[PDB]
Symmetry: D4
Subunit: 118 residues, 8 copies
Amino acid sequence: ADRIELRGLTVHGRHGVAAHERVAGQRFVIDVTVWIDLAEAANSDDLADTYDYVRLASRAAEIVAGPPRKLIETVGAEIADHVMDDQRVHAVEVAVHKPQAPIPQTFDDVAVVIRRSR
Amino acid sequence: ADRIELRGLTVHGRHGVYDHERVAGQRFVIDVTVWIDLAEAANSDDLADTYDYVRLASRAAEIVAGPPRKLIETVGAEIADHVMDDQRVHAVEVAVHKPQAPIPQTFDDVAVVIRRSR
Amino acid sequence: ADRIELRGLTVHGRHGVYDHERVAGQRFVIDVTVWIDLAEAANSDDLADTYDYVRLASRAAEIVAGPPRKLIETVGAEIADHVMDDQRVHAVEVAVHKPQAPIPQTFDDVAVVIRRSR
Amino acid sequence: ADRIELRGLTVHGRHGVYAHERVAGQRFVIDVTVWIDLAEAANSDDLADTYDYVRLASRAAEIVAGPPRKLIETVGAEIADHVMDDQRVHAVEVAVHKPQAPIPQTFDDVAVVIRRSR
Amino acid sequence: ADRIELRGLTVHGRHGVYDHERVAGQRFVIDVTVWIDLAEAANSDDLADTYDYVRLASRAAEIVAGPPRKLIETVGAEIADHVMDDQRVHAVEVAVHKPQAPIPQTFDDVAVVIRRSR
Amino acid sequence: ADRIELRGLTVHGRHGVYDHERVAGQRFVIDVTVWIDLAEAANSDDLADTYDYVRLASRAAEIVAGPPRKLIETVGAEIADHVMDDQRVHAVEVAVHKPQAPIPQTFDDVAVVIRRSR
Amino acid sequence: ADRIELRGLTVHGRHGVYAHERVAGQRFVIDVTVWIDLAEAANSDDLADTYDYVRLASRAAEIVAGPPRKLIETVGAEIADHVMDDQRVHAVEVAVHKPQAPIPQTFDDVAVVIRRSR
Amino acid sequence: ADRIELRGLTVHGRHGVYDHERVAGQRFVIDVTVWIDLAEAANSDDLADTYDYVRLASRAAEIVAGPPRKLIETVGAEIADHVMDDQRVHAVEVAVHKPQAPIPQTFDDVAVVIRRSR
Ligand SMILES: Nc1nc2c(c(=O)[nH]1)N=C(CO)CN2
Ligand SMILES: Nc1nc2c(c(=O)[nH]1)N=C(CO)CN2
Ligand SMILES: Nc1nc2c(c(=O)[nH]1)N=C(CO)CN2
Ligand SMILES: Nc1nc2c(c(=O)[nH]1)N=C(CO)CN2
Ligand SMILES: Nc1nc2c(c(=O)[nH]1)N=C(CO)CN2
Ligand SMILES: Nc1nc2c(c(=O)[nH]1)N=C(CO)CN2
Ligand SMILES: Nc1nc2c(c(=O)[nH]1)N=C(CO)CN2
Ligand SMILES: Nc1nc2c(c(=O)[nH]1)N=C(CO)CN2
């Protein structure tokens, strides 16, 4: 079950179904899990044989801070689709958290998890 | 494995087997995981193509805040059955936590998890 | 230095300087520290000899949930003045936290602390 | 996936392979997950229709606090087999944690998970 | 400022003003801070020249677990007066926390801090 | 004791004595505490009568993100001097934390606090 | 689903693809999960019939503090292969976390998980 | 109030009054607070003008990991005396935490705090 896991990537963005929400924006938190065979990379100790976590983080942050979407579903899909551009990846899961969602209730977190797989 | 995840929804309520528990009630904490295909919603960026987290939290809180049940089994079944009314939903899991359960032992949490699926 | 400490009182409200902050509102988190002599309540074991935390928490919640102010300073001052109406209180400090304040930076918390004394 | 989850049951105990660990004991932390069908309990709202968490916690704590064993494996098996005496139980997992394991390394936790099932 | 600090001492008890709080009781969390000069003990490395935390924790646990008081004020004063029976002590602060207090608001903690000193 | 408290402002920077620290930089965490009279602000409910947290966070972040210093002391002084620019301010304390400091020991945090007063 | 779990093993090391990273090194955090049948060990209460956690943690820490590798992939592979040396083991997963990875984004953790099995 | 704060320095050691505590040892956790004027440092940006945190953590660790004392008071005084050897230091507080202290109550932390000044 070889995988790469990025957790708690924290980025200010402006996604939200309502206009009032894109005025100032809010905190988004991203998790990404990438399923990919890692044995070649442990054998070569060559970055080229694995998925560079650094570029994973950068691309996810750029997407979150980029053009606003109404749904976090759409954000999550764009990140997941980007990951799947690497044909070595068996599957990805992208969690888009909105811990500051303007909800009159008291809760810790709300998120969507987008899965892609081949 | 697309899903929506609500975590730590915190609502005061009156559930419990013994009478003394429904004098002042206590803190309940609710998690809901909804398995649903979110591909269209990411395609459309339209709220109507997904399950609105806002109403997921509202309804969960209403039920917890509502008529008292003896068991937390009952509460989670009523939230889960509500979520399954949306025929887009493949399955649901509702965790009802009772972290202030009056037991003399020391413990972080106790909960039931009710699972429903097609 | 005898005192009563309420920590983490969490209430949804609409305080804020600009109009966007008021549409949906956000989570406010309140602390109250009440300096009062507690020797007599220890000797009588009688609630009227101390400051009842029960009414403290509900009145604080009422003020925070209520009509919005522009500044959290003035929310804090309303809670502090309420606590000072009790002649037994030597001093009080009210922390009004805005941990979801809509600013672009990544930060854990922002708050004001209002102090009153006789 | 219907289940009951007890988390963080904290009990002083005296298990350990070495004599030094029987002298004063240490903190043990227990998790129990019980897979059981809860639909009838949700339908009757009758505690007899479910596994009572109160007695789950009490018997788990009695065993942890009980006769010392060398291995946490043994402790976890005794708790799991106890839970399985309830024929409605499909399976159980008991995790016995020894967070204070006297090892020179720095670490958050060490534990065993014992699984029983039919 | 030399001091001994005990934090998070967790004890089940049955304190409280109203009848319902005593059927089952609830979790109490105690902190103690003891101001005492520690230079002698550093000089001798002899437990007799300091305040033994071991007796501090069992005696404070004993008091909390003991016959119920109506107020947590009264519990903290018995613990503080116990510590002050050691003439070496300059002062003490006892925080009695009632994190599961049966009030309808959502809050992290409520506590009283009893101070005594010569 | 009226004050404004900003906690955990998190900013990547390159501060550090030696050259290796400057290649990639590391996470810095800033707290600011501003002692200022808030009574007029509560009476007017007018942002001009207080110290705006928004400008405080953005400026503090700019300073931490900017050209590196050798010492976190100097970063802290630069933030404290900025705040003291406001003649209404009685005093300020700035904490600059370096929780990822590249030292071989295992530890939670290392920081400097800088105070200024008038 | 009998298993042994080690969590949060914290060890300073010098893995990294760039030279600047091996100059002073950084904190790594390791998790190990060992699937193995534990019924025999519960039967006998004899350490020889299970996998000793103590040498699990030792060997893992030695490997992490050992010869630096470019990739954390390689570190996990080495620990995983060591575990599989015991013919009783059905499978293992080793999580190698780099929570202080020098990337300019703000995130909680990044890790790789290596699995070996039958 | 200018100061340097080190928090959570974690070191295995063998301190303890009773014989059993010395066979395997246990985790100790140290905090140090150093009061020292930091203005000159901020002026020169030169490490020589301040108290170097990395030698502070190295020497504190060595002390904790060295030959055992009976009391944590004497460990803390040894660290404090070392810090006062720098004649620029005004005052120091050292907290020695024994979070795994082998008492039978359930608690989060026990510690002593040693202060020294001029
Ligand atoms: N699943 C889901 N629900 C929502 C979403 C969201 O992006 N996805 N956004 C909303 C308000 O911003 C309200 N509700
Ligand atoms: N499974 C389970 N056990 C119980 C329950 C509960 O709802 N579910 N409630 C009780 C106390 O009110 C006692 N124990
Ligand atoms: N000190 C202070 N600063 C602020 C305040 C406020 O309440 N207090 N509110 C703002 C926007 O709602 C912006 N700035
Ligand atoms: N798996 C396993 N390993 C151990 C155990 C134990 O209980 N189980 N206890 C030990 C010291 O008591 C040493 N190592
Ligand atoms: N200060 C304070 N307030 C209270 C107390 C208490 O112990 N102290 N107990 C209550 C009911 O148990 C209600 N309110
Ligand atoms: N007080 C203090 N000590 C140090 C400093 C510093 O910023 N302040 N930075 C160093 C390495 O970057 C090491 N030592
Ligand atoms: N998957 C993965 N990605 C990386 C790694 C690494 O160890 N594994 N190390 C890095 C720089 O040291 C950059 N990128
Ligand atoms: N204050 C104090 N009390 C204790 C001490 C200790 O070091 N200091 N250690 C003990 C056994 O190690 C028991 N009690």
